[PDB]
Amino acid sequence: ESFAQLFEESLKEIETRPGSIVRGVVVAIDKDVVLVDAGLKSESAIPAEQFKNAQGELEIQVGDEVDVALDAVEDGFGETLLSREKAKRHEAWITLEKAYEDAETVTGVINGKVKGGFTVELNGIRAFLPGSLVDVRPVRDTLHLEGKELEFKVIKLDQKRNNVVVSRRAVIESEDPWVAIAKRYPEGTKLTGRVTNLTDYGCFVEIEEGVEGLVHVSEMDWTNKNIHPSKVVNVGDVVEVMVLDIDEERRRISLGLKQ
Amino acid sequence: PVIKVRENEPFDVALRRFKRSCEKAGVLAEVRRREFYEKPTTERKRAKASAVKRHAKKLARENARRTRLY
Amino acid sequence: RKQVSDGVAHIHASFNNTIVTITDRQGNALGWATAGGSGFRGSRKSTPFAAQVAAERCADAVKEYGIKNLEVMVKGPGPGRESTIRALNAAGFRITNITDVTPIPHNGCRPPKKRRV
Amino acid sequence: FCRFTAEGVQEIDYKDIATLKNYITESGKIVPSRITGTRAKYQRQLARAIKRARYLSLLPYTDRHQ
Amino acid sequence: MRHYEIVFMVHPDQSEQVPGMIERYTAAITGAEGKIHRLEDWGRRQLAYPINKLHKAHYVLMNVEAPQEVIDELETTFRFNDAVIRSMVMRTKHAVTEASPMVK
Amino acid sequence: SLSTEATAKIVSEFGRDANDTGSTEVQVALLTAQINHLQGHFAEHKKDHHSRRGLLRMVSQRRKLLDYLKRKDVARYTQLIERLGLRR
RNA sequence: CUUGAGUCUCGUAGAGGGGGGUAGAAUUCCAGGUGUAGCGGUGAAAUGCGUAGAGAUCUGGAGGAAUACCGGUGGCGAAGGCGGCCCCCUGGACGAAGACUGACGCUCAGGUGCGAAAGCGUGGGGAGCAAACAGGAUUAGAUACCCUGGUAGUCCACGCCGUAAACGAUGUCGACUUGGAGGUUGUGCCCUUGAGGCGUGGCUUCCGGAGCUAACGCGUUAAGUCGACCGCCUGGGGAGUAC
């Protein structure tokens, strides 16, 4: 009756769009596809590579629950955008928690400055940093035991572009993209960027606040023409890329990957 | 496409940068289009036909993609 | 003749023939060479190889001016655009600027009619 | 991803040269709306502003000319 | 009557004269009960391209609510005056009084 | 086009209520004043065909209005055409 | 009487029209500098221009025409058509609410106007392009295609011409009938918590359902279902010709 109408609004009330409500129960595993059901129109064709943790083997059997992501519906049949992105929100919450007490305390091990700043990795993911943040002072972890264990103390974050730089050592110590597009510019600032779609001439890695990069086809590897990008890297993966070139005018930042 | 060789920059790299700049400008294409005169009708026809081709490529092939080849 | 350290190379690159002209920075030409003059005719002078050797010839010509630095201006569409500048480089000058100097009208004069072939 | 909509400007100013310089080419060209993602309504007026600047020698018509 | 937006440019060698001309202009506008909402001496400024062979020039911006007749008079003055190399009288909808982005 | 103040005026004179603005006679007048205004323009600009097309349309519409008035109420039409000076 | 039709109020976007200014690039020519033997052109040539200094290159000047980028199955216009900025005069369209008029409407034989390009007349102008023409090629021939030149014209003013595959090959006006994906331009609400969310109007591109269709296809912008008015067709040629 209005039973059903009340239920419809109830079920509205007890779900949300993003990957927030850990609801999808893993109802079939086979390699290389995991599948869930989060109260959506269809079941998600999940990769296995969203769900192996830090050493390469699976961690969740049948019945286990992780939320995924939404706001994109039915490319022709199916439902979702993947769940690790959901994990990105949890990582963002942990990073924000710092604000409360002005200190987020984890493990942070930064061996080398990709784009000027040491790379700091939190449990599964690894993020890239600006130079100063790796070290509180000129200490320079190159003389520290390789991949050492301290923490991360935040020096700098870009706040729209997920670039976060953190201070590994020294426990005692405690429109918009295109006007000032000179930050990752100079010649060779490398970046950690997720690829989006490979257009058979390109890969379209683009992460840094609403920009677009192309590592198109020529570099990508150390073979030129017989390469077919889909075979050689991935879909949806954070990689080594750097700028190599910027247009601020015709908005074509032409990244590379042969580096 | 004005360019200046940076200090301790290789020549070949500089040439490559220049070529890229030219490509961006579309100078060669510009020249090609202005070699002789195109009738307005012809210009219109080309533009329209190109758009039609683009639309075909966007939609019909997508539809085809839905179905598997083998 | 007065020696000059820095000067220009103007590269007039046509479809049919390339023309290299070295000049001082003010505008006064020092020497020049051509693919047609390098002994290239018809099919042969409309080629990158023809253009590079024309560039080489021009470089040889202005030896007595003892030019070291050079900026280049590339005009027109042709094969002798990249090849020419490479040849110039090889000839052993410090290339300073590479500029593209094609005359693009902002829709001025009517071009001649399309060929029927 | 248009800037003007987000800012909510009533009209583009040819005087605000820096804003303009973002939308012009290194060679001086006006940048397409495909690349900038500017809204059509906003693109036209932007072009108008650029040209007014060019008349006023605030912006150059092209990189080469002198 | 109608809100015009004038920007005129003076030859740099005549920069010291610039105030008087401005005053003169202003006076005319006042004569016909025309208001003058904003007025910005921009000063000497590098040109994006050299007009009439010179590379710098003196910019003056000017905002007027005035009758068309005086505007026409001003235009004629400008065209005959050799000091001002360029001018741009340009209509506007409102009195815009807040001033310009780079004066800021 | 006609200036707002002039519209308001013409409405005031010919309209009975001065808020009406839609009264046939008022309308006729508005058209007539516009036609008069455009006469000088077109004396200047003889090739301005596009604008003249409007002018002609306005005339035709005025004309239709006059005819309507005639059939409805003859006297009022007479008074209108004495006020405006329309030969017919 | 107010639903159709129209007026008034405030805005909106626009290559809509007419007039008058102006900007930059590029071509051409002139004058001068530097400089030296080629340039140019094609499939390949040759005619042609060049040592009386061309081509290239730099400086200065003249003049005409058109407005790169923006720029878009974007916009405006009855159609033809309209594209650099500025100003002056000017027509239409749309939306928002209200207020008014009160059927004032639709269509239209004759009639009247507008009407690409070419063309004509008189007077101006003339950079580039280019019917005609000339030369060089090609060819069996080449009164063509290609090359080198090149005059009417293209440009402006005022007249005439009144035609085009002037095409959506689809008369105008009104009503009704499943959908999707867009574009553009308004506008109402919504925490704009963000580029968004939910509507509601105008114009517009593509796909497609019922139905229609000889099929192709059209398909809420009909070529569907109906009404009003007009225009037009009656085998091919002869002929849109003769008188």
JSON list of C-alpha atoms in Angstrom, two decimals, chain D residues 16-59:
[
{"chain": "D", "resi": 16, "resn": "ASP", "atom": "CA", "xyz": [41.44, 42.14, -16.45]},
{"chain": "D", "resi": 17, "resn": "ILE", "atom": "CA", "xyz": [44.33, 41.06, -18.64]},
{"chain": "D", "resi": 18, "resn": "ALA", "atom": "CA", "xyz": [45.60, 38.25, -16.41]},
{"chain": "D", "resi": 19, "resn": "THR", "atom": "CA", "xyz": [42.32, 36.42, -16.57]},
{"chain": "D", "resi": 20, "resn": "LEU", "atom": "CA", "xyz": [42.48, 36.85, -20.34]},
{"chain": "D", "resi": 21, "resn": "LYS", "atom": "CA", "xyz": [46.06, 35.62, -20.61]},
{"chain": "D", "resi": 22, "resn": "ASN", "atom": "CA", "xyz": [44.93, 32.29, -19.28]},
{"chain": "D", "resi": 23, "resn": "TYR", "atom": "CA", "xyz": [42.68, 31.83, -22.32]},
{"chain": "D", "resi": 24, "resn": "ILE", "atom": "CA", "xyz": [45.05, 33.03, -25.07]},
{"chain": "D", "resi": 25, "resn": "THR", "atom": "CA", "xyz": [47.71, 30.99, -26.80]},
{"chain": "D", "resi": 26, "resn": "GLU", "atom": "CA", "xyz": [51.48, 31.32, -26.49]},
{"chain": "D", "resi": 27, "resn": "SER", "atom": "CA", "xyz": [51.20, 32.42, -30.12]},
{"chain": "D", "resi": 28, "resn": "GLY", "atom": "CA", "xyz": [48.37, 34.76, -29.06]},
{"chain": "D", "resi": 29, "resn": "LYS", "atom": "CA", "xyz": [45.42, 32.67, -30.23]},
{"chain": "D", "resi": 30, "resn": "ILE", "atom": "CA", "xyz": [42.14, 32.48, -28.40]},
{"chain": "D", "resi": 31, "resn": "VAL", "atom": "CA", "xyz": [41.82, 29.04, -26.88]},
{"chain": "D", "resi": 32, "resn": "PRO", "atom": "CA", "xyz": [38.86, 26.88, -27.93]},
{"chain": "D", "resi": 33, "resn": "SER", "atom": "CA", "xyz": [36.01, 26.17, -25.56]},
{"chain": "D", "resi": 34, "resn": "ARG", "atom": "CA", "xyz": [36.61, 22.42, -25.96]},
{"chain": "D", "resi": 35, "resn": "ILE", "atom": "CA", "xyz": [39.97, 22.74, -24.27]},
{"chain": "D", "resi": 36, "resn": "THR", "atom": "CA", "xyz": [39.07, 25.33, -21.69]},
{"chain": "D", "resi": 37, "resn": "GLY", "atom": "CA", "xyz": [35.66, 23.88, -21.03]},
{"chain": "D", "resi": 38, "resn": "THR", "atom": "CA", "xyz": [34.28, 27.41, -20.88]},
{"chain": "D", "resi": 39, "resn": "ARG", "atom": "CA", "xyz": [30.54, 27.82, -21.25]},
{"chain": "D", "resi": 40, "resn": "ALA", "atom": "CA", "xyz": [29.40, 28.96, -24.68]},
{"chain": "D", "resi": 41, "resn": "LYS", "atom": "CA", "xyz": [27.75, 32.14, -23.47]},
{"chain": "D", "resi": 42, "resn": "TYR", "atom": "CA", "xyz": [30.86, 32.94, -21.48]},
{"chain": "D", "resi": 43, "resn": "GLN", "atom": "CA", "xyz": [33.22, 31.97, -24.31]},
{"chain": "D", "resi": 44, "resn": "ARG", "atom": "CA", "xyz": [31.79, 34.50, -26.76]},
{"chain": "D", "resi": 45, "resn": "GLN", "atom": "CA", "xyz": [32.19, 37.44, -24.43]},
{"chain": "D", "resi": 46, "resn": "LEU", "atom": "CA", "xyz": [35.65, 36.25, -23.47]},
{"chain": "D", "resi": 47, "resn": "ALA", "atom": "CA", "xyz": [36.64, 36.38, -27.12]},
{"chain": "D", "resi": 48, "resn": "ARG", "atom": "CA", "xyz": [35.10, 39.84, -27.37]},
{"chain": "D", "resi": 49, "resn": "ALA", "atom": "CA", "xyz": [37.12, 41.00, -24.38]},
{"chain": "D", "resi": 50, "resn": "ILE", "atom": "CA", "xyz": [40.32, 39.57, -25.80]},
{"chain": "D", "resi": 51, "resn": "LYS", "atom": "CA", "xyz": [39.83, 41.38, -29.04]},
{"chain": "D", "resi": 52, "resn": "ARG", "atom": "CA", "xyz": [39.09, 44.66, -27.30]},
{"chain": "D", "resi": 53, "resn": "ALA", "atom": "CA", "xyz": [42.32, 44.20, -25.40]},
{"chain": "D", "resi": 54, "resn": "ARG", "atom": "CA", "xyz": [44.16, 43.53, -28.64]},
{"chain": "D", "resi": 55, "resn": "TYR", "atom": "CA", "xyz": [42.84, 46.80, -30.05]},
{"chain": "D", "resi": 56, "resn": "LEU", "atom": "CA", "xyz": [44.10, 48.51, -26.93]},
{"chain": "D", "resi": 57, "resn": "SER", "atom": "CA", "xyz": [47.53, 46.89, -27.20]},
{"chain": "D", "resi": 58, "resn": "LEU", "atom": "CA", "xyz": [46.96, 45.23, -23.86]},
{"chain": "D", "resi": 59, "resn": "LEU", "atom": "CA", "xyz": [47.13, 41.84, -25.45]}
]
